[PDB]
């Protein structure tokens, strides 16, 4: 089987700059004066996008950004004005040899200028604590860059137990991300305490950004 | 236009089989390759192997061998790939594609089907609950929506039946209690919303949960 190793597996790069993934084949993939390297595009939740076909040719409808070279065993995928849109992982594709074999794919992030998250901490909603749970859920919107650390206090101690995550995708629009936090209790567990409080530590601000409620 | 559209998502029991359709429009059926393609929760793509609707030949890939059966109805335009005794670890997105067949056309798959989300799991399918979330009892306010403990995949949320699209954070579901939980967020201006409605719209086809939720100031 031909194996196709992408590089980097990960790769940022800032509006309208130049973005470059390599391809190498373990095994030539070019067959006589053909070539069978492909490349697509997938973004999330949907199925892969051809790009460029027999290693050089720009498939219809996809923008002259979009560009590749190389022969043999070596490729390349070129993107110039990388685009809030690009935001996508790539691969590239062997369809000389059966079995046919992709590439592990390269994850391009769009830089963009650094965003605070815009917080917000939401109590249990009623119709959950007559059900017997108790959500808290902390929204942390439009940030970037994506590393960002959740805190979640209880009555001022710190709480790591009953907390989960949930990440968006880099907006194809403005570039940024969003995170959901929940932190999820029993209804007993939720009322034997007051304060409850979704600290975000991130890059924009030394302090960490705090929203905090007071069961009552 | 080259249309090609498969069959919705599926819930199957481990050890079962699971037979996914891939029906074609715009082209002649006969006289083009179906590729069929994986792809795990999170990972990459995997090729399964090829049929030709014009004689019936198929490929298979070798690690597929003995569990993928290609299939095709001229009689309908439709591709099948049947999948037997499936493991937990077979839930994937199953794709279907169209390869190029002309010289110089490096046999690039250029038309792909939506893909097929497969589940393997003896877990019930569950209706979810669905909350309001209202601010706590600025320029700007934001809303939520919660989806919790629903099983299988999907469910669609909107607010304000989609008319309301812009300002909107829905995040992928986590795995809570060996079931799904999201959530949505939607921003508006302060002036807008405790004063006009604001709903999110809940469906989870599995289960057949059709619910709206008015988002309601907290007291």
């Known amino acids: 089987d031909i194996v196709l190793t992408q590089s980097p597996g990960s790769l940022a790069m800032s509006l309208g700059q130049r973005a470059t993934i390599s391809c190498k084949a373990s095994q030539s993939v070019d067959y006589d004066g053909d070539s069978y390297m492909n490349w697509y595009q997938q973004k999330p939740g949907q199925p892969p996008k051809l790009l460029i076909f027999?290693?050089?040719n720009l498939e219809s409808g996809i923008p002259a950004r979009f560009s590749g070279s190389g022969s043999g065993t070596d490729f390349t995928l070129n993107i110039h004005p990388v685009e809030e849109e690009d935001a996508a992982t790539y691969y590239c594709?062997?369809?000389?040899?059966?079995?046919?074999?992709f590439g592990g794919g390269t994850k391009l992030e769009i830089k963009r200028a650094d965003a605070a998250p815009t917080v917000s901490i939401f109590p249990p909603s009623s119709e959950q604590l007559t059900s017997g749970g108790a959500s808290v859920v902390c929204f942390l919107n439009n940030f970037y860059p994506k590393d960002i650390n959740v805190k979640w206090k209880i009555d001022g101690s710190e709480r790591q137990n009953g907390v989960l995550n949930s990440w968006t995708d880099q907006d194809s629009k403005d570039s940024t991300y969003s995170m959901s936090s929940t932190l999820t209790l029993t209804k007993d567990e939720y009322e034997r305490h007051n304060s409850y409080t979704c600290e975000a530590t991130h890059k924009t601000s030394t302090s960490p950004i705090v929203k905090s409620f007071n069961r009552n | 236009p080259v249309q090609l559209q498969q069959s919705g998502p599926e819930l199957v029991k481990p050890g079962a089989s699971v037979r996914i359709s891939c029906k074609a429009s715009?082209?002649?059926?006969?006289?083009?390759?179906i590729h069929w393609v994986k792809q795990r929760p999170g990972q990459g793509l995997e090729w399964i192997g090829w049929?030709?609707?014009?004689?019936?030949?198929?490929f298979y890939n070798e690690k597929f061998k003995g569990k993928a059966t290609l299939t095709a109805d001229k009689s309908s335009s439709t591709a099948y790939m049947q999948l037997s005794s499936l493991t937990s670890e077979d839930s994937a997105v199953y794709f279907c594609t169209r390869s190029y067949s002309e010289s110089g056309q490096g046999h690039a798959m250029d038309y792909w089907g939506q893909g097929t989300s497969v589940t393997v799991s003896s877990a019930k399918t569950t209706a979810p609950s669905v909350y309001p979330l209202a601010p706590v009892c600025g320029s700007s306010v934001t809303l939520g929506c919660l989806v919790k403990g629903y099983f299988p995949e999907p469910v669609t949320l909107t607010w304000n039946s989609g008319s309301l699209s812009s300002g909107v954070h829905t995040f992928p579901a986590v795995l809570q209690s060996d079931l799904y939980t999201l959530s949505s967020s939607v921003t508006v201006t302060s002036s807008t919303w405790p004063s006009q409605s604001i709903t999110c719209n809940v469906a989870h086809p599995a289960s057949s949960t059709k619910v709206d939720k008015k988002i309601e100031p907290r007291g």
């Open positions: 594709q062997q369809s000389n040899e059966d079995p046919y074999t």
């Open positions: 027999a290693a050089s």
């Open positions: 049929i030709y609707p014009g004689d019936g030949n198929t």
């Open positions: 715009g082209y002649t059926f006969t006289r083009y390759n």
